[PDB]
Amino acid sequence: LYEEDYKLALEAFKKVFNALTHYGAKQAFRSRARDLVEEIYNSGFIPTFFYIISKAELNSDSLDSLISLFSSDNAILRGSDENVSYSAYLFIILYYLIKRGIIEQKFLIQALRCEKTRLDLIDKLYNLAPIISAKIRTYLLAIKRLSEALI
Amino acid sequence: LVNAGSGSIVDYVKTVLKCIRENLNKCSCAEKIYSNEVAKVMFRVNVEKANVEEEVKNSLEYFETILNEGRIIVTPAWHVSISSALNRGLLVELELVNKHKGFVIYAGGDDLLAMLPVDEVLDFIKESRRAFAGFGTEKLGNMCLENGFVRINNAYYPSLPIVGRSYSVIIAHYADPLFFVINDSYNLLEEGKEIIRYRVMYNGEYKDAKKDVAIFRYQGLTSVIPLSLKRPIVSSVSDFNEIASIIDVILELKKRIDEGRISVSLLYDYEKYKHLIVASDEKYLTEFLVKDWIKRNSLRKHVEFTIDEKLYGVRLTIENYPIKIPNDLISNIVYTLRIIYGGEK
Amino acid sequence: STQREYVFIPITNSITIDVKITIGGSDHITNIDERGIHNVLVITGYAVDEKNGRLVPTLDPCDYVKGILVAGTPQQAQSNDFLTLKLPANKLYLIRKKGNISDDLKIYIPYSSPDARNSMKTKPVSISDDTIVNNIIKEVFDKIYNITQKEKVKIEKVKEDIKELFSYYALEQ
Amino acid sequence: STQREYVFIPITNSITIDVKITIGGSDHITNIDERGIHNVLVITGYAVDEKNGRLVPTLDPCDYVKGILVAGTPQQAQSNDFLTLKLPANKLYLIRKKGNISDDLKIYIPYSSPDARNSMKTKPVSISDDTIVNNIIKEVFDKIYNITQKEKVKIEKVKEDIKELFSYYALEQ
Amino acid sequence: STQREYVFIPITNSITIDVKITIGGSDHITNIDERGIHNVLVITGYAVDEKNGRLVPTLDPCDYVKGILVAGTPQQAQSNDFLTLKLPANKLYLIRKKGNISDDLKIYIPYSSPDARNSMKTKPVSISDDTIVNNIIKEVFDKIYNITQKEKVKIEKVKEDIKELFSYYALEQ
Numbered sequence A: 001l002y003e004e005d006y007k008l009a010l011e012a013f014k015k016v017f018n019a020l021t022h023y024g025a026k027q028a029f030r031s032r033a034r035d036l037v038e039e040i041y042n043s044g045f046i047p048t049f050f051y052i053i054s055k056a057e058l059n060s061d062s063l064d065s066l067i068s069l070f071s072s073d074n075a076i077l078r079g080s081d082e083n084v085s086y087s088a089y090l091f092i093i094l095y096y097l098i099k100r101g102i103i104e105q106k107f108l109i110q111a112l113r114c115e116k117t118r119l120d121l122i123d124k125l126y127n128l129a130p131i132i133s134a135k136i137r138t139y140l141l142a143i144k145r146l147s148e149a150l151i
Numbered sequence B: 001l002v003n004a005g006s007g008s009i010v011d012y013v014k015t016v017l018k019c020i021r022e023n024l025n026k027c028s029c030a031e032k033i034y035s036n037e038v039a040k041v042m043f044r045v046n047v048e049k050a051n052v053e054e055e056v057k058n059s060l061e062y063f064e065t066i067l068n069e070g071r072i073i074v075t076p077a078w079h080v081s082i083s084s085a086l087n088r089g090l091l092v093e094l095e096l097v098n099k100h101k102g103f104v105i106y107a108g109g110d111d112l113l114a115m116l117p118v119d120e121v122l123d124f125i126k127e128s129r130r131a132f133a134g135f136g137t138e139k140l141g142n143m144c145l146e147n148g149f150v151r152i153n154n155a156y157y158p159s160l161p162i163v164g165r166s167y168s169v170i171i172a173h174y175a176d177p178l179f180f181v182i183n184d185s186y187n188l189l190e191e192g193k194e195i196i197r198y199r200v201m202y203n204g205e206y207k208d209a210k211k212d213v214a215i216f217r218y219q220g221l222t223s224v225i226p227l228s229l230k231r232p233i234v235s236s237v238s239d240f241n242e243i244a245s246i247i248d249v250i251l252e253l254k255k256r257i258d259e260g261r262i263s264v265s266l267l268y269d270y271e272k273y274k275h276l277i278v279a280s281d282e283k284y285l286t287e288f289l290v291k292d293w294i295k296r297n298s299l300r301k302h303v304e305f306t307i308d309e310k311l312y313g314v315r316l317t318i319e320n321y322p323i324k325i326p327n328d329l330i331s332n333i334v335y336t337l338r339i340i341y342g343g344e345k
Numbered sequence C, D, E: 001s002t003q004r005e006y007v008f009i010p011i012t013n014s015i016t017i018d019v020k021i022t023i024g025g026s027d028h029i030t031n032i033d034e035r036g037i038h039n040v041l042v043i044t045g046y047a048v049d050e051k052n053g054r055l056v057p058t059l060d061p062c063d064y065v066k067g068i069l070v071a072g073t074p075q076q077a078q079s080n081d082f083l084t085l086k087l088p089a090n091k092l093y094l095i096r097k098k099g100n101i102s103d104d105l106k107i108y109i110p111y112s113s114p115d116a117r118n119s120m121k122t123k124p125v126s127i128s129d130d131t132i133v134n135n136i137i138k139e140v141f142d143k144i145y146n147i148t149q150k151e152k153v154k155i156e157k158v159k160e161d162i163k164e165l166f167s168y169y170a171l172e173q
């Protein structure tokens, strides 16, 4: 079933290997992979999604060179504190969520474009936490493997 | 045709072909080439009569005959030259089988039917395939084989390097009925060798190939190992090491699991790596991935296997037969290892 | 270098008004060495206009006309209706080539316009009516090369190869 | 009707100013059918002069230069330096043949003065260094058939066709 | 009886400090004479032990070595572990006999010790790894003959001959 996921682990990626340059917050991505995956499948998708958004603000260059990876290629997400380099995993989750129709690019795009709607996006995710955690399982474990292989 | 005959005629011959090439009409073009002969026929005086007006026409008539029939026209010289190299290869594989403690039931030229222990079957297949092409390392009696020829004490006889040879190994219990064992071996060979296709590169372009496979079976486990990876299997001397270059990869991997450096879990672990290794189009990523699949199952400090990265993307297929076969060479390798090791049960 | 001349073997008597003096250099490419004519030359992609005999430039790979490289100069005022050229004898279509290779030839060959109004339907030609073979042996095989009918009366060894070898493409229109 | 003309294709410059009427009639003989350049013209005997680009012929049939045939009237003022030939296309040396034509045509080929005061030594100079096919694909591959850059994203295909197909003999003088 | 020195070519980068003056006679047995290398020396019953690359005397006729016979002296300090012998130049087994005949020749074979404790399972290994060819022509095929890479740039005629004619035996033990 999830055989297309192993290609999505690339066409979403587009780069998180030197767009995440300088080997600091780059080699921190293996931590993201392993720990976040383990915690999503022990704690939950919501307790982890909160923890992830807390490390990446709204309406800033984070959002700029996060949505820039929706219609562009060169997005050097550089910055030492994992806040532009923490939106890596956030974008990883969001690209899957949109390209698998779990949530629609209409609602998401229009939602992360004004403060009123981030609450509603987060509530929508809360309503789809089990579905998302079940589907994104293999797509994420693939990146936990891709890290310990390449990253 | 251009490449046969160094002499002074090769240029003449390729000019004849330039004539034939693009259907230049009957002798409506030979005026381009008869020159290249009539300038040369008059280098000698003892030539009695003049007969160069037609022989240049018969030459391109013959070359067009070949190129338009699509096959080299056979002559008795062709047949004796073939079926003598066939018996020479017979004499070579005879001493090859005896080297690996085998027992030759029958081995005539192309065919072979021998019983070997499951331990020296990969080694034997590698050696016998490379020798059938006429390329080896040791002397096999008095047939001292050398890179496409067979040197018998300074006499160079040719071999069959361009010919493909298939294999069909059956790992059978000593008590299995030989009737069904022989029938299944013959059937696997004659059937699988004509129904399975693997990704081969032809003039720098991936196509599909049919023959040169090694079909292992063990009571329900099957695996296919290509032995060509180039559809004209040999066109230079660089090709003679590509021959069965996967069987020595499987050998290297077998001599890591004996030494206890790699665990047999390596054979029960590749699946959770293939689903990612096949959807990939980046070489230097697949290399890391296989290194991690080997890293996770090694037992010593740091093993080194380094699959040759020309096996990645090799896609085996089938025309819907009851033979089940993984569609990638890297998984057929582990299935071949599972078969071999089941042979030591 | 030795300056030469080129004239062909047509089935018409358009050879006579082509040259002033038969000789004028030191030697020839074309020879007769008691085994018949040596060093015949053919040129590809052309043909004779048997009336006012010259060369027509075609582009058929089959087209070819056989002519003789004699030592001369065609009336000392041409190079406007005969072609002027220089070939280093490394690029000659020299049949029965037995004589020396001068390695630098300056040649005068007939060459004019094709008059591209009709289709140059050019066909082969054979030198039949052997009376004309004799007459042409009287034409050039004697006036250009004097050495005939003096050193050998045996023309019958050289009378048949003129019919055999000398064959070209004729416009016939 | 279809008065064709020839264009030679060496690696050299000064090929786009060869003519003024480029498209000419409705079509040409050559065509690119998204598989290969069909009906490619090669002449047996003509060779290009390195200065004042045109084809000067050499008697050796082994001398040859390739090109394609286009349909047009060169510059409205040439055909005084271009040999006009009238052939039925049965004598045409076309390579990479695809189909057939109306069986009656007329060609204007670039022919150059021979320059007899120098010998004719020709070497085969072929096409490579794809920067040299760039100014052929942009200049004289578009100008002949403006169909390019419209549906055929396969200019790489025709680039390789040129890479394997085209050569000539140069005088290098 | 001009003194020459036999040098061979294994895959190793080992033939560098062996002949200080790559000459010492008035000619060279070997010759690259427009067809490639010619007059190569072949010896039967030996094999090159690439580690400290030198020949080794065994008894097997399956084993042979090939190397270019050149002129020079054995490091002006050898004949302790090297070899020093003479030859009548007639009993020889030459590849492409095209060069001179000395009729009396003293040569020096780079030679190694038996070390009769390891069983010499010898394998045939001809030249591979084209880079070793291309830096061998730099290391040896330019220090023996200045004509190489000065008069001729056409080095391909020895390039393929390196792979075709130089085949030795590797002990790999």
Ligand SMILES: [Mn+2]
Residues within 6 Å of the ligand: B190
């Ligand atoms: Mn059969």
